[PDB]
Amino acid sequence: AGRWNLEGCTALVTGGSRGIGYGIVEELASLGASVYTCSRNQKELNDCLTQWRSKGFKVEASVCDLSSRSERQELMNTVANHFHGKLNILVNNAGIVIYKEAKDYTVEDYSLIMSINFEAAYHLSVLAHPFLKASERGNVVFISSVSGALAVPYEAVYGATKGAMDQLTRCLAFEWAKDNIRVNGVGPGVIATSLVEMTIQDPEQKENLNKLIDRCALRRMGEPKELAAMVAFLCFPAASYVTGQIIYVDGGLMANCGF
Amino acid sequence: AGRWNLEGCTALVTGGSRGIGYGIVEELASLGASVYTCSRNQKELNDCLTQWRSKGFKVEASVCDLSSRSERQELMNTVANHFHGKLNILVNNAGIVIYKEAKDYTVEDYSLIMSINFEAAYHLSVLAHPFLKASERGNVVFISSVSGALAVPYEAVYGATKGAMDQLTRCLAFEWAKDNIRVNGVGPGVIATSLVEMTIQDPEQKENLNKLIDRCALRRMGEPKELAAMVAFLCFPAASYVTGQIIYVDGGLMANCGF
Ligand SMILES: NC(=O)C1=CN([C@@H]2O[C@H](COP(=O)(O)OP(=O)(O)OC[C@H]3O[C@@H](n4cnc5c(N)ncnc54)[C@H](OP(=O)(O)O)[C@@H]3O)[C@@H](O)[C@H]2O)C=CC1
Numbered sequence: 243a244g245r246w247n248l249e250g251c252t253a254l255v256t257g258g259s260r261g262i263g264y265g266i267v268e269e270l271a272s273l274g275a276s277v278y279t280c281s282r283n284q285k286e287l288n289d290c291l292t293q294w295r296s297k298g299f300k301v302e303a304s305v306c307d308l309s310s311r312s313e314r315q316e317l318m319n320t321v322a323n324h325f326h327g328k329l330n331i332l333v334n335n336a337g338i339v340i341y342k343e344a345k346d347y348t349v350e351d352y353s354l355i356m357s358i359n360f361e362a363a364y365h366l367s368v369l370a371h372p373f374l375k376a377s378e379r380g381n382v383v384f385i386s387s388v389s390g391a392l393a394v395p396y397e398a399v400y401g402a403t404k405g406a407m408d409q410l411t412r413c414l415a416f417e418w419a420k421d422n423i424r425v426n427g428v429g430p431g432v433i434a435t436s437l438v439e440m441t442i443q444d445p446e447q448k449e450n451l452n453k454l455i456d457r458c459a460l461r462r463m464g465e466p467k468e469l470a471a472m473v474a475f476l477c478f479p480a481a482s483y484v485t486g487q488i489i490y491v492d493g494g495l496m497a498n499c500g501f
Numbered sequence: 502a503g504r505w506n507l508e509g510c511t512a513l514v515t516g517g518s519r520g521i522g523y524g525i526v527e528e529l530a531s532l533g534a535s536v537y538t539c540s541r542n543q544k545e546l547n548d549c550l551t552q553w554r555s556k557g558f559k560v561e562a563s564v565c566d567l568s569s570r571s572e573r574q575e576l577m578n579t580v581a582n583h584f585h586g587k588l589n590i591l592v593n594n595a596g597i598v599i600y601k602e603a604k605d606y607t608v609e610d611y612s613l614i615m616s617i618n619f620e621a622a623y624h625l626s627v628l629a630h631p632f633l634k635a636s637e638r639g640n641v642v643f644i645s646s647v648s649g650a651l652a653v654p655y656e657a658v659y660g661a662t663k664g665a666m667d668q669l670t671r672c673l674a675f676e677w678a679k680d681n682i683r684v685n686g687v688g689p690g691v692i693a694t695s696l697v698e699m700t701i702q703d704p705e706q707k708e709n710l711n712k713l714i715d716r717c718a719l720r721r722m723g724e725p726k727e728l729a730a731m732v733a734f735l736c737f738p739a740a741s742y743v744t745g746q747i748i749y750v751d752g753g754l755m756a757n758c759g760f
């Protein structure tokens with residue numbers, strides 16, 4: 243792979259059937275990377291591959307439910323073989339939201355979200371490790387969130403799962419340093435995905451969301467591709483010295499206080 | 502309570518039989534409050550009650566394994582009855598550590614730390630909400646850690662539970678503000694507790710701790726009564742404007758880079 247491209251690198255992106263995941267798969271594939279993705283639905287995954295492959299992308303995908311530990315270890319075996327035991331990139335993007343107050347969560351809501359958003363990202367992380375090592379040049383990216391560092395309505399537990407993700411990141415950077423793996427986190431602000439439109443369906447979630455956009459410097463939502471670009475760059479060999487960092491692609495949201 | 506005392510306020514402090522917790526029970530009681538604590542050992546708790554009651558501190562304690570949903574509701578039911586449905590202070594001090602690299606952690610290990618470190622704290626704050634609210638002047642304080650923001654050897658997963666806890670502190674301070682509850686965190690640095698005596702028994706860990714201590718301006722371990730003094734202040738009516746903060750009592754550990 244060259245300094246500013248991933249020509250020839252193998253990558254695994256979770257939750258790539260839509261949104262940011264879908265933008266990350268396209269961005270990486272278009273820069274030379276060979277990709278593997280997964281979602282909980284096959285028909286959807288297949289329609290994705292149809293579009294992706296008409297563009298000459300090298301991509302493969304398969305149905306996986308990241309809340310199922312056993313299914314997670316199945317996916318790694320499958321990807322490991324697909325790439326012949328060499329994986330350069332692991333992009334932990336899969337995530338789910340549950341819009342409730344902290345005191346309104348059920349043990350089911352909490353157990354579900356902590357296993358898909360954190361545990362799963364952590365588990366695949368550890369599973370991919372030996373394959374990331376054998377790549378001689380591994381890279382791990384976690385898709386965090388601004389809500390993992392600041393209070394946002396209805397995202398206390400959701401924010402808790404990302405805040406834990408952010409820390410695993412910093413540590414893993416030092417723990418896998420000698421293994422040639424660089425670990426970084428990318429925190430999206432507000433990106434126009436399917437998760438957002440489903441949100442705005444609510445006349446209150448819609449009101450909460452227009453408050454966030456009005457709090458950006460750019461005063462608008464990002465695009466999956468503007469976000470996927472940060473992820474892509476971190477994997478280029480030109481970012482050899484960047485590790486253990488949580489970078490936000492939020493149009494300025496993070497830096498704002500009274501604007 | 503006067504502005505600089507906790508005269509008359511009731512408090513529950515998880516894990517008050519040793520270390521920081523034991524110290525917090527002393528500082529709140531010593532400042533005029535009625536405390537209720539818990540640990541997983543009756544005998545231990547019974548010597549404490551004798552020590553505390555001997556000094557004139559109003560205090561009660563019951564046994565409880567915070568890593569158990571049912572035992573947790575059991576303890577809140579008892580606290581609430583002991584205090585007549587009014588709770589001013591809740592200090593989520595209990596915690597454990599399993600010193601393994603992230604990849605070496607077993608599932609049983611993961612379940613243990615997450616449940617005691619972030620689940621019981623989160624769950625207890627919720628069951629307490631009505632009594633804190635009924636109390637008319639609530640204050641929740643979460644004992645976090647420096648390892649919840651910075652990479653430390655063998656604390657990748659320990660540090661994730663704390664990173665999660667920190668984010669939950671910031672949102673609660675916003676969700677519960679109207680209920681007149683203030684929510685803060687206090688991140689200890691290296692405090693001379695039973696958790697530390699145990700640790701420094703192993704030569705390599707003894708070497709790591711010495712690295713930490715060597716990295717704070719004051720170059721020395723804090724004392725339990727030093728961490729407790731900050732918890733008590735935040736409960737004072739004097740700190741009525743402090744909410745949603747994570748404050749570190751670490752001898753300067755969080756400001757250092759090259760010292
Ligand atoms: N755009 C935004 O507003 C922001 C999003 N984020 C974070 O960005 C990431 C992606 O968000 P976004 O693209 O908007 O989400 P979308 O809902 O648009 O897509 C999420 C993708 O992940 C997949 N997925 C979810 N759960 C699983 C599972 N259990 N097993 C396998 N695949 C799964 C989904 O597939 P399927 O549904 O078929 O299972 C889907 O392809 C998340 O981690 C989110 O927390 C953070 C801040 C902002």
Ligand SMILES: NC(=O)C1=CN([C@@H]2O[C@H](COP(=O)(O)OP(=O)(O)OC[C@H]3O[C@@H](n4cnc5c(N)ncnc54)[C@H](OP(=O)(O)O)[C@@H]3O)[C@@H](O)[C@H]2O)C=CC1
Pocket residue numbers: 515516517518519520521522539540541542545565566567568593594595596597617644645646647688689690691692693694695696697
């Ligand atoms: N000491 C240090 O340097 C630092 C400590 N901390 C934090 O400080 C807090 C206290 O630590 P520290 O005093 O050092 O530790 P100790 O081990 O000295 O004390 C922990 C206390 O919590 C109790 N506890 C642990 N698990 C449970 C459980 N499952 N159910 C009920 N009680 C429990 C213990 O009782 P028992 O074992 O008898 O059940 C004990 O009373 C923790 O939240 C820790 O994460 C953070 C950074 C630094």
